[model samples]
Target: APNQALLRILKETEFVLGSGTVYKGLWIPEGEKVKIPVAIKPKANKEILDEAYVMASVDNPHVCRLLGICLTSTVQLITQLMPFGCLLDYVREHKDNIGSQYLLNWCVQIAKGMYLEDRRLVHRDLAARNVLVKTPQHVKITDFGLAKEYVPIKWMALESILHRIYTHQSDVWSYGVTVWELMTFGSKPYDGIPASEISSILEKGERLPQPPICTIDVYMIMVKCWMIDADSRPKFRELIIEFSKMARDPQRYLVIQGDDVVDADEYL
Candidate 1:
């Protein structure tokens, strides 16, 4: 019943890199000459163990890779290091210097990652903070702590907020918010609005306004994700196609037109 391959005992040379809410450490993989850094989350109880199982089953370049589960004195999750840390911090730190092309490419990658074949699995939490940046353009979704008992009010779809339903469509809604975060260099969604008032604001059909730097085409994609009708929203595959086209033609898609100003308020 044991997953022998996923079981790794920590090496004596493995050392802690950082620590806080989660203990992060670096370890060289067995038989590997080059030292590969990894994130270590200790005290893996049932929920954490479930996270390990979920991560092990996922194999995607845009999703964080799980190296193995370490069973030393305590169980731990070993995942590939996201050196730059979470996308939220990375974006804020390099906001002025980062190019729009890189942000568009990240959008493509995130959409590709969200296209999970399994309909049963829904990433209840999909936000910039949950996404880790390996490089400015290369990012991966992490913190698959699974569906929480509590709601992430800011990221919830109208249906999710009203009826306690969660689906891929809801994740699409969150993806819209995450994209907004990237466009705004990690500005909080609905900045002035209180969390409790967001639901009512959404009921009134007021979505997050377009970021100053985001082009009309890019903002339109986020608007599509925030569609009132969940079924009306584009699927991850469709979103990937849309973002791919934009990423490919950055000069065209990334530019702001005089008409963009006219359409901005209309979207909200």
Candidate 2:
């Protein structure tokens, strides 16, 4: 019976856990992490519904510019499947993570599946928080507060003229951010910039640049994601391949090399 709708639901929360979402009684998937039930979507207080609508409905030309407006069904699906997304969090907390070969490869597969969705169906909000930690680490891309579905071809055609704008690639931008979060131990995206500032910067042909702490690979991918056009963003298929490669042999990166290098090597 409602499990008594307990307030202190989950056993582990990031704030309490200090970085990792690792819980002992949980089951995580290959590329997933686990988070116990945190807080319920607080009773709709102010104008969240209105805000969600604006995000979905905005005609911004940039993918990063679009708001993540998910529907009830989308939100349920995401909440139910959030565990996989948390795995990255767990992994990040344990080490100076460069890449996750097994995990990244699997994420590519997931990305491929999402790629096949009606090209207009977008999961605009995909940061780590939306991703709940669960068994098999189900990667639930929760919060369709900024989700929108459209005809990919039609959206692209209109977007070409700088008129109508929307596409799955918008999700790709979110995906890139998710990747960044995964790679960086769950860093806040645009930690300092207000949402309004992000919107303003994006509208004038700019995006929160990959921060200095951002790894090179993460930075490169984010730059592409921050592109002003959704069309310009790489598809999950491509991103999957690129990320999978990184996962398979992350040591190939200069960052990894540098981290592993002795001071003498730099001298040479």
Candidate 3:
């Protein structure tokens, strides 16, 4: 009830960044500026409420920041707006400028975000569109409307697709596809295939091809994410470990300007 009172006082401005399952727009709060999203449908409201709960609880650099929430006529969520917007657009706009190591670093940041999430929680919709770019060097995982429990057919693991099962590993599968998107500069996954055919293709052991510029190491990780048996996939923690090592290695891959080596004791 107290939270709902907060929403009534906020106002939405004219600039709308994006809208659909949720809304992204400018917000005015106590004479200041902020970026926020409002969700109204009963189903969406329920999901956004859950999203608010999870996001509010997690504290990590790679995870998006949730400022406040209100459940008045509708559910309103105020979040820190990333200057660069969605990861898809950011990658597409700067694909040519980004190198292999930097791309891998972004992947590590993403894994870090998921790594910080509670084990019982799952980001059911992990994709490029859901990742937000704070800068070329940083991104924060966002959009949890379909997270805790929902599905996007193309990104689901085989088990999830067949039995409606969702788990951290299922999110790993989607993370792998997202890696493909980053590597391919936002190309549609399984381009040209009808949505109905993705399952059959996977059953036959087919998977997304390595991005043209994607390295053998990264592609191998992506392959691991798609293991038909959800149990076989690497968790976000394991992925963060590998990606961190790769990102920190001066010679394993191209190191960016500010990239620093990690002390073994730090993560432990």
Tell me, by lDDT, which candidate is best.
1
Rank ordering of all candidates by lDDT, starting from the highest: 1, 3, 2
Query: Count of backbone clashes for each model?
Result: 0, 26, 0
Q: Write one digit per residue (lDDT tens) for candidate 1, span 1-268.
A: 4434343355545545556335555565446444556677734477877787777666677888777776656567778777788988888997767776888898899888884534246888999998988777688888888643126789889888888888898899999999999888889888777888988999988999888876788888899889988899989999888988888777676643331111111111
Q: Candidate 1 at 204: error in angstroms?
A: 0.9
lDDT tens digits, residue span 160-238, model 2: 2244445676666666666566555556656766554454455677544454344577568767865666678787767
Instruction: Name the weakest run of 10 consecutive residues (lDDT summed) in model 1.
Output: 259-268
lDDT values for all models = 0.76, 0.44, 0.73
Candidate number with greatest TM-score: 1
**What stretches of model 2 exceed 4 Å from their correct place?**
1-103, 106-110, 113-120, 132-140, 143-165, 204-206, 209-218, 254-268
Q: What is the lDDT of residue 171 in candidate 3?
A: 91
Question: Which residue pairs come into collision in candidate 3?
Answer: none
Candidate 3, residue 95: Cα displacement in angstroms equals 2.0
